[PDB]
CSV table of C-alpha atoms and ligand atoms in Angstrom, one decimal:
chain,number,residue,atom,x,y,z
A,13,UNK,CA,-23.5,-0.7,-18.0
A,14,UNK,CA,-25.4,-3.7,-15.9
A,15,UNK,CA,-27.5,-3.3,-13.0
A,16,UNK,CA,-25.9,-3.2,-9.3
A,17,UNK,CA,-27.2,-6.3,-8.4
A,18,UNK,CA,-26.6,-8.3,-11.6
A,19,UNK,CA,-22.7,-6.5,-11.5
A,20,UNK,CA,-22.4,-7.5,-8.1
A,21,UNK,CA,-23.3,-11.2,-9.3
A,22,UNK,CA,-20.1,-11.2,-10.9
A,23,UNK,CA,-17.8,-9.8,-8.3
A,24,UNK,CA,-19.3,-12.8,-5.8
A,25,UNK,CA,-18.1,-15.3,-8.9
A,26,UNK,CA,-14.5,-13.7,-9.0
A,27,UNK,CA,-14.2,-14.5,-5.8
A,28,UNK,CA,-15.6,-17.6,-5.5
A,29,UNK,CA,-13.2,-18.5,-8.2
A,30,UNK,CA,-10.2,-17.5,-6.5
A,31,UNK,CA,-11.2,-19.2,-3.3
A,32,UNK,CA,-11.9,-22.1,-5.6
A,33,UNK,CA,-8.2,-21.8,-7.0
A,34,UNK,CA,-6.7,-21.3,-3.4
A,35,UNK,CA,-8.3,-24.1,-2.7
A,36,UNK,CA,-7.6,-26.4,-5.5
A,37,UNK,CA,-3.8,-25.4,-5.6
A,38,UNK,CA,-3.0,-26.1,-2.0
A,39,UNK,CA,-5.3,-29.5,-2.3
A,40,UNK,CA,-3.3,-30.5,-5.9
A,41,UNK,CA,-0.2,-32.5,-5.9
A,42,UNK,CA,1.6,-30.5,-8.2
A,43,UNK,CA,4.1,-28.0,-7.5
A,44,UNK,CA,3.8,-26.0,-10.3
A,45,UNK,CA,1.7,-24.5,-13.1
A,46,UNK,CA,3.5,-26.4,-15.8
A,47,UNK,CA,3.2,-29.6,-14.2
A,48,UNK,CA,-0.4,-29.8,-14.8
A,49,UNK,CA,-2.3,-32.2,-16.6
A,50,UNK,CA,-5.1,-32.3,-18.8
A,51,UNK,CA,-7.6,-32.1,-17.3
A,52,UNK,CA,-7.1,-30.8,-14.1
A,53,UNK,CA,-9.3,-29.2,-11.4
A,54,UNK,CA,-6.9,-25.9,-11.0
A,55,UNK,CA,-7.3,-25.2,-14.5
A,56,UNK,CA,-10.8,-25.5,-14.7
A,57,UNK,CA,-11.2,-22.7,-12.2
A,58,UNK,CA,-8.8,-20.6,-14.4
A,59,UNK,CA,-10.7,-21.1,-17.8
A,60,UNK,CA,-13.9,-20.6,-15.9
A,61,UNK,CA,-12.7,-17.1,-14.9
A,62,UNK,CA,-10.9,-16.1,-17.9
A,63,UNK,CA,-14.0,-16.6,-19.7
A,64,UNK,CA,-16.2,-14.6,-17.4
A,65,UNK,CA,-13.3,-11.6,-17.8
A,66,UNK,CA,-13.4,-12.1,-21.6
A,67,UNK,CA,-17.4,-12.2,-21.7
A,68,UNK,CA,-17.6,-8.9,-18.8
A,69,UNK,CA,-14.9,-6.9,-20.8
A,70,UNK,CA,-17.4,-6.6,-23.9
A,71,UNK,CA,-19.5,-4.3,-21.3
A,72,UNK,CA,-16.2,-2.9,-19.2
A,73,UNK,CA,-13.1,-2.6,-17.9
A,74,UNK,CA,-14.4,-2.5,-14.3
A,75,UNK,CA,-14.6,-6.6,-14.2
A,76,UNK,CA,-11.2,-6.7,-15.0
A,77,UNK,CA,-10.2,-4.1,-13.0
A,78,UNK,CA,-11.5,-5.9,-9.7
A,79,UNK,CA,-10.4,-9.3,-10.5
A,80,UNK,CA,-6.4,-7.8,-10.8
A,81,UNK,CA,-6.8,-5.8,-7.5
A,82,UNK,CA,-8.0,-9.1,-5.5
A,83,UNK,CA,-5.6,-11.3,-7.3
A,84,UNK,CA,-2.6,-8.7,-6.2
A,85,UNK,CA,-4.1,-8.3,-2.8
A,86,UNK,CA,-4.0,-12.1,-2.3
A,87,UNK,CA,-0.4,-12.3,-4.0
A,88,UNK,CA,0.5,-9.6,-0.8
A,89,UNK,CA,-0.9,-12.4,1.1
A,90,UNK,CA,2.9,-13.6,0.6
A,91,UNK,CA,1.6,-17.1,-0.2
A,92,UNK,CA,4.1,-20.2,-0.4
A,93,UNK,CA,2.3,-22.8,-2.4
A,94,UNK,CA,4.3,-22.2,-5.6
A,95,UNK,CA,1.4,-23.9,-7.6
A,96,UNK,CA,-0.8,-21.3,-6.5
A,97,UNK,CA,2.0,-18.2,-7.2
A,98,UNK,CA,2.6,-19.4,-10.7
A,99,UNK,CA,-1.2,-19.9,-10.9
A,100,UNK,CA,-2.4,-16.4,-9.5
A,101,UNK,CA,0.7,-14.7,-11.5
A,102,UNK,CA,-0.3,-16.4,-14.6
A,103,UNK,CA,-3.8,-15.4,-14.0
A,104,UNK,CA,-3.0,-11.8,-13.1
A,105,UNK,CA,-0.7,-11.5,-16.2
A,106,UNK,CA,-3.7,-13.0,-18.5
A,107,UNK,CA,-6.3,-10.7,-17.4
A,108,UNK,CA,-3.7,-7.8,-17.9
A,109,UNK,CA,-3.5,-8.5,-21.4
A,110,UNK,CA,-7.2,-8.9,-21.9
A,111,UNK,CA,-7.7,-6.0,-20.0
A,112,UNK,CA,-5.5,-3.3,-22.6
A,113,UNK,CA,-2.4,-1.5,-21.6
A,114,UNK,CA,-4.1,1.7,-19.6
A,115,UNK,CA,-5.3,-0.8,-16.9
A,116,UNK,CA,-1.9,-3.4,-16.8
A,117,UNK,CA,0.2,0.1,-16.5
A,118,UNK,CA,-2.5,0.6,-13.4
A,119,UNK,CA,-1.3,-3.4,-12.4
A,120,UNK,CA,2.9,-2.6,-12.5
A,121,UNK,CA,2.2,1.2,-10.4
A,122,UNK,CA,0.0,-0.8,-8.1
A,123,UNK,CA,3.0,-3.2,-7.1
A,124,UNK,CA,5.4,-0.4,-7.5
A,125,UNK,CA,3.5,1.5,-4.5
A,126,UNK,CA,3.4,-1.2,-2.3
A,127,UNK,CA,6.0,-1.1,0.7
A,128,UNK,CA,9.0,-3.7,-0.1
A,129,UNK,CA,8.7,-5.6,2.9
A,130,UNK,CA,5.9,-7.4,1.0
A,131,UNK,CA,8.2,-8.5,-1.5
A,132,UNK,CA,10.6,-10.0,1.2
A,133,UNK,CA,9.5,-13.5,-0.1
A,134,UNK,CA,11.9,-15.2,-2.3
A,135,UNK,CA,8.7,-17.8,-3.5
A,136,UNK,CA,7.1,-14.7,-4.3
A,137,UNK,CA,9.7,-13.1,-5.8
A,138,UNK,CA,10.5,-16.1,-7.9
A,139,UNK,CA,7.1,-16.3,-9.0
A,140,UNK,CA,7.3,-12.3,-10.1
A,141,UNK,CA,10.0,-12.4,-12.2
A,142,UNK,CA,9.1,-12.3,-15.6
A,143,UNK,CA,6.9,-9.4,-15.0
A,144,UNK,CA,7.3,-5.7,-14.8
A,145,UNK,CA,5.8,-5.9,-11.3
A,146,UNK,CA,8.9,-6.3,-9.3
A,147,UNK,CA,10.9,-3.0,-7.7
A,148,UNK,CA,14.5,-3.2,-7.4
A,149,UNK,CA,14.8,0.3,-5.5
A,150,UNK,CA,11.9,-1.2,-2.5
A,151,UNK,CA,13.0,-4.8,-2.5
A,152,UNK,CA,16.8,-3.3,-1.8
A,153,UNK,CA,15.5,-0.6,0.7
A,154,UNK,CA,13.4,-3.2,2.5
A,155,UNK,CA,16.5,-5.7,3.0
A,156,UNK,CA,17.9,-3.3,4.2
A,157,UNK,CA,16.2,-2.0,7.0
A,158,UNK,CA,16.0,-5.6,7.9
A,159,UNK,CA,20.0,-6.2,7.5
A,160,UNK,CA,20.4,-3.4,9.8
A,161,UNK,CA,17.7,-4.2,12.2
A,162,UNK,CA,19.7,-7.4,12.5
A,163,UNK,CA,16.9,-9.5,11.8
A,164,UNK,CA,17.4,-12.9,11.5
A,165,UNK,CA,18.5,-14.9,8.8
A,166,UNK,CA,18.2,-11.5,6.4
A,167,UNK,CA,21.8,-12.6,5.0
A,168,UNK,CA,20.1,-15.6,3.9
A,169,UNK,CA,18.0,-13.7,2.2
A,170,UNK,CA,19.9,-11.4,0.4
A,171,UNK,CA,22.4,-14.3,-0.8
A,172,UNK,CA,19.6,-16.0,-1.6
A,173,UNK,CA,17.6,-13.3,-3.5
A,174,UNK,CA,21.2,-12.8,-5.5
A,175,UNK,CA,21.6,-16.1,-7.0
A,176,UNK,CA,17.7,-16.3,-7.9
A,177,UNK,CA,18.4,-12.7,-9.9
A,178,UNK,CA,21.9,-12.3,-10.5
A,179,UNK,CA,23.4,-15.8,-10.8
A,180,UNK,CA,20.9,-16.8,-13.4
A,181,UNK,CA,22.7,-17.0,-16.4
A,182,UNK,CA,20.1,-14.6,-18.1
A,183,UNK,CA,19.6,-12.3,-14.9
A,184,UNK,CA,16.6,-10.0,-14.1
A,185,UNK,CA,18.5,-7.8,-12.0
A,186,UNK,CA,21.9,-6.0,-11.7
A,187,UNK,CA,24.2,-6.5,-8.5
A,188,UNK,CA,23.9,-2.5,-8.4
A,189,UNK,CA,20.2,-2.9,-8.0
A,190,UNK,CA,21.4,-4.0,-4.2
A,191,UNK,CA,23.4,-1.6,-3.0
A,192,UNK,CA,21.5,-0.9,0.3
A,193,UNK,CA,21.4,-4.5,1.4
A,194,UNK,CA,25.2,-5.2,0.6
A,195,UNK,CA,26.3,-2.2,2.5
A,196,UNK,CA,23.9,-2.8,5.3
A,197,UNK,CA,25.0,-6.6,5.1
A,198,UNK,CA,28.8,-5.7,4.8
A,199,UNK,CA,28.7,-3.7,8.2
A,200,UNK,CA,26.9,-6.5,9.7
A,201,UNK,CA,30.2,-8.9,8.4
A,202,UNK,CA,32.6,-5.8,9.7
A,203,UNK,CA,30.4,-5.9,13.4
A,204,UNK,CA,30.2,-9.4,13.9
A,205,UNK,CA,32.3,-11.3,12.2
A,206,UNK,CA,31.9,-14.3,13.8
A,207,UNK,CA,28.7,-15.2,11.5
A,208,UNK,CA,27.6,-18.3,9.5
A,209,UNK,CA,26.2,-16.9,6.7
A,210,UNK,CA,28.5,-13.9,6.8
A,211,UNK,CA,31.2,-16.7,5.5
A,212,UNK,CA,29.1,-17.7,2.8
A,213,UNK,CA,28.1,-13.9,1.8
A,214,UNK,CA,31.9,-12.5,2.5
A,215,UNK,CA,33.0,-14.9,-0.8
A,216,UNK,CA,30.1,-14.0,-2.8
A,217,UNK,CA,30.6,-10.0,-2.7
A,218,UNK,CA,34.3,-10.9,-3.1
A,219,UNK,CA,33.6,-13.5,-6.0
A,220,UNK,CA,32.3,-10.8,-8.3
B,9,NA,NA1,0.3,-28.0,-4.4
């Protein structure tokens, strides 16, 4: 309902805001979102565009809309700073809300359509879960091309990935979510034996 130059203004500011946070979070002490005092630099950038989505969304959705696809294109990004995953998450998952159901449905098939491999982050991943966003089926299809591609340190990964999800007391996944990897993993164990991690994996999938 604005003009295209004054609409445009606002796009600039979204991103100027999440440059600001990229910024801010990798500059900032803290590890993560919790941590963070009152007040604090990284959640002045945060307010500053949660009130700019509250104020757009009273014209439309399309604000909104833009802010979630650049804060899931940067989230791709695969970034490591966990201050700035819990921080972008927490921002995505805000704007979601504000945003109605129709458009945070439009958020979870976004990262449902993305290829796994992007997901092959376990910082990321931890950061994810609490969402609807993650993809069991991709994430386990991904490892697994990996697994069998014999690329290195995937074990690591996948024993990794298994006590972030599984081994949690309260867990986000099923072990059946992974069949893919274990198989591809297990014939890895049955090729080369002979492996460090393989040990370590072996007692896992045995421990069950
Ligand atoms: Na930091």
């Amino acid at each position: 309902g604005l003009n295209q130059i004054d609409s445009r203004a606002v796009a600039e500011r979204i991103n100027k805001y999440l440059e600001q946070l990229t910024a801010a979070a990798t500059s900032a002490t803290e590890e993560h979102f919790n941590e963070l005092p009152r007040p604090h630099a990284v959640l002045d950038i945060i307010d500053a565009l949660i009130q700019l989505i509250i104020k757009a969304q009273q014209t439309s959705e399309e604000f909104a809309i833009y802010a979630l696809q650049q804060i899931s294109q940067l989230l791709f990004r695969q970034p490591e700073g966990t201050l700035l995953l819990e921080s972008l998450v927490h921002v995505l998952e805000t704007i979601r809300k504000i945003a109605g159901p129709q458009v945070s449905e439009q958020v979870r098939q976004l990262f449902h359509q993305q290829p796994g491999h992007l997901f092959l982050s376990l910082s990321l991943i931890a950061a994810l879960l609490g969402t609807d966003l993650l993809d069991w089926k991709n994430i386990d299809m991904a490892m697994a091309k990996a697994l069998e591609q014999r690329k290195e340190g995937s074990i690591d990964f996948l024993e990794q990935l298994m006590d972030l999800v599984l081994l949690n007391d309260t867990p986000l996944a099923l072990f059946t979510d992974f069949v893919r990897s274990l198989e591809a993993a297990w014939a890895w164990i049955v090729e080369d034996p002979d492996l460090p991690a393989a040990q370590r994996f072996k007692a896992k999938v045995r421990a069950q």
